[PDB]
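go over this record:
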Amino acid sequence: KTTLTAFGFASADLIEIGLEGKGFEPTLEALFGKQGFFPDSVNKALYWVNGQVPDGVSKVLVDHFGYTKDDKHEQDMVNGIMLSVEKLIKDLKSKE
């Protein structure tokens, strides 16, 4: 909110923008977290698709989402993404 006082001793709010929300805590936990769609998708993209980001981006990606060097699953990019989509659908339609 923002208010002007220039007409003497009379107050007047310029504009108020009210963004209210509820239920975003479990959504954030399901999106970014241990079993999040984004971390698993980034891990699969970095493991299967060739092309390594520089260290300055690699460290940030490892810290936020997480990267796995060795994987004993031969599921390929398609299964890596469709499992992530499946788990995200469950994370979505399993809460408020």
Observations:
- Strands lie at 2-4, 12-15.
- Residues 47 and 69 are 7 Å apart (CA to CA).
- Helices lie at 24-31, 37-48, 55-64, 76-92.
- Residues 76-92 form the longest helix (17 residues).
